[PDB]
């Protein structure tokens, strides 16, 4: 417990789980909506998915 | 009539024609009538081939 010849400046993060609030404007973003449409991806020895 | 028989010829025929094939796709490049009657067809499969909403999608599946 004898001072070397130096100091040292010790750095850390630290994370914080929080709640928010967020407040969007009337009529700010235009959506356009297209139809939904399905395809077949796989044939597997048993099932089949979508 | 004499005997009733142990299998039913409407079960088996029922049965089997529901295993056939899909059929070609054919489209007449000849007459313009064929053709029309045919390109309606393809864009009608089009449709019911990738509409989700349908179950006939699911069907040709």
């Given amino acids: 417990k004898i001072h070397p010849g130096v100091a040292m400046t010790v750095v850390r993060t630290d994370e914080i789980l ?3 609030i967020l407040f969007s404007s009337r009529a700010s973003t235009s959506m356009f909506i297209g ?3 399905v395809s077949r991806r796989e044939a597997r020895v048993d ?3 979508f | 009539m004499k005997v009733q028989g142990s299998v039913d010829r409407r079960r088996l025929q029922r049965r089997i024609a529901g295993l056939l094939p899909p059929p070609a796709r054919r489209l007449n490049i000849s007459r313009g009538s064929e053709f029309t009657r045919d390109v309606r067809g393809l ?8 509409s989700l909403s349908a179950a006939a999608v699911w069907r040709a599946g």
């Fill in chain 1, 18 to 20: 929080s709640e928010n």
């Fill in chain 1, 35 to 37: 139809t939904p449409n």
């Fill in chain 1, 47 to 49: 099932a089949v998915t």
């Fill in chain 2, 43 to 50: 864009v009608e499969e089009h449709a019911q081939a990738s």
